[PDB]
Ligand binder design. Sequence first.
Ligand code: CL
Ligand code: CL
Ligand code: CL
Ligand code: CL
Lengths: 222, 222, 222, 222
Amino acid sequence: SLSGRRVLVTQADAFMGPALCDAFRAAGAEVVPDRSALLERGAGRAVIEAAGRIDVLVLNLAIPFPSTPVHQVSGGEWETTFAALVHPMREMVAAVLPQMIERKAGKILLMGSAAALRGPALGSSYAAARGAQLAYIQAVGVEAAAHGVQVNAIAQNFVENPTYFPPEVQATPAFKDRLKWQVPLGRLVTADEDASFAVYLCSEAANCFVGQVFPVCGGWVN
Amino acid sequence: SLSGRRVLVTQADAFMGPALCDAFRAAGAEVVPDRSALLERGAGRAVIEAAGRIDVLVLNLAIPFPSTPVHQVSGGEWETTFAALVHPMREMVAAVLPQMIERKAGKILLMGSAAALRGPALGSSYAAARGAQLAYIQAVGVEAAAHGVQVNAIAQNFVENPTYFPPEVQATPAFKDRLKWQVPLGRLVTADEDASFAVYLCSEAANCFVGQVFPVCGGWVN
Amino acid sequence: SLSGRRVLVTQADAFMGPALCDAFRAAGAEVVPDRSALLERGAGRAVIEAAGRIDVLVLNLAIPFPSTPVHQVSGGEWETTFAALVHPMREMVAAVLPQMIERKAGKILLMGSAAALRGPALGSSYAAARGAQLAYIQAVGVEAAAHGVQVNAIAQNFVENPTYFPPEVQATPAFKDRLKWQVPLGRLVTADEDASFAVYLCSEAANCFVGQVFPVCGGWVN
Amino acid sequence: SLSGRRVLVTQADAFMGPALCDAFRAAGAEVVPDRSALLERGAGRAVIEAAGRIDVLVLNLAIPFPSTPVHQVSGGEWETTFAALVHPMREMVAAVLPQMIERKAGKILLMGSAAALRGPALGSSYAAARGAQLAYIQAVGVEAAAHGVQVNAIAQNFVENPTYFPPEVQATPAFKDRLKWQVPLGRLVTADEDASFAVYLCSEAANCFVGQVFPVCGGWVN
Ligand SMILES: [Cl-]
Ligand SMILES: [Cl-]
Ligand SMILES: [Cl-]
Ligand SMILES: [Cl-]
């Protein structure tokens, strides 16, 4: 039971935010659903500082999937991708660790992307940002293990959510075929399956997981 | 809740068997703790057939870790390793799937070894058998996903258990150093952490996992 | 240059054998193309012993891809799969290592399968055998590194060869679609690309690779 | 033979640059050894544009390994790490692809880091940048495969080179022990082994490799 624990969930209305908030409420936690814009220097530090005590930080972060060929990407599209997905992650982790290290206890979970694990044919700058996320979480988890703090990542794809798999995507035949030929599960991971796994990864039972990346994508990548 | 579900656990007194049985009892399941010897042709089929209805099959299988250099291994040591770890796994999976396919529901979990994922310097025939286990579970999970049956594997090492990490091993300095230099967790995974993860992997929340190998080894392998 | 080196290639008329033999001839090696049946106990030891000095052992091993659902596989089909792919590999490695250890030099390369890395929907017993191969080669490579002997594996799929990708397979529409949706390369790896990589892995330049599995499958698995 | 081919190697005096330049000269290529500072916006585009025809782009990029705990890293140290390792990689790939796509032929090889694959206990911002590199190269390789261009990465560690493994590091006892307990090879990969593998990956024999990450670290990671 995550009873009387404070769980902050970023971009709570987007990506996995809704399901995460529901799931952490049902487990009995005090959920702080942050909707702040995170693009500006210092914004992520501000979210953490405004919250006071954090027991669990769930980095739910997302942008629309860019469609740009790799040679026509601007330096600005690139730096926007990293300003949305990468720089806030670092600000928030660095702001929240000190209190978890002091308490010798705490949970950080990244809701990252399997596009860092299996290259896409059009999301080159998206894939780069998501890879920065995964490698950072790995390194921070190894660091923080020494202090009793667990930092881990989900690497997901083909999960039902409004940002990357809304119904309009699901109706396209390209998606139909991507499921047939690439997803052994043969269906989308439901938002609630994903969020229950997140809850497990933020429980004491999961104190043995430090710096680990868990793929959640119906067998699309293993 | 795994309420009124039948969970069969092989070699229940060895390796992870005790912790698994405790954990599945606490989740409210009817636990069948099998202690049969499995070496003989047909023995594993007999265990499954004697049990009648299986909702969850947990393949807890183990032998002592052999110390033999690769060029001095006999054909008989080899075939004994496979007769203990591999052939019973196949008999039991093939015996239990038909009822799970008919019910369009069921769970198979292999308690396998990370030695299949990171080569050891002396367990060549042990590592081969454990690799057969992992690749089989992968293939069977992809097959059975079509029928609503989830077949997955834990790939573990550095978990507290009497077979591979009894106190005498823990006192040796080679182990002291293996933890220091190879296990980011800095301690053994407890038997109960491992068994709780097994329970989660055999719950409905985990219906999204088919044919997946989950490393459970404190960051020894990722 | 592999000049005046003896390179033994098993099942030389099947799978990658032709291309391997051509490629190792062109690099200037003395190629021993073995066509022996390997099913019987002792057959693989006999091949190695008949050859005298081996500098490079290339374990090219294959059987037809079985089509059997996992629950209808017989114990005999299973043990035949392992008798063709697994037990000869062990006999031959254990027979050839002593002379390589004495010379503090030598190369063993397994031509294995990516089906051990990504579960297939019908090759459950084939996938198990191929996984035993990969995990064994990993463990033996870690052992033999101490002696200056390099033991490695290719894990291949979607390579042009008469056993798994003859023209009749290539014409089917299921294959057409498997390439479209699963092989980033968009074509089969040619036999000569595969064999050149094998030659590189058996050169001195590759003395840094011990117990490593190299996927060769056009991005099907990474 | 890489005869009469132009091969540009970035930071040619640092990291793997010397060995790469020697190795590509010996294979008969016209080597362009660039020593430019790459930190400024547009600098990498300038290097590519000044070179005219590029047949092979070898992204040799490096900075000193930072020693900073994750919670004391400044936003500026972070953005400097990415400005040295990540933003120039993108500028140079996007500048050089158009001519390779037009020629339906070309090679890009990243000299990346296994620290993206196995989290370090102090290089959190270094690990993040190196992960961005690997995921980007993966995505670009999948994109460019359609055009006959091969984009791949080496993910290395424990290679002899002045930047990360100079003699002073090699004498420390922490390194002594890291080899003993973590590197199955039991020695450093030589610079020339690493560079020969780079040359192979930029040859036609390697046209089957698109978007693939090859670990080169003596078995430290697999
Ligand atoms: Cl998703
Ligand atoms: Cl264990
Ligand atoms: Cl193949
Ligand atoms: Cl290095």
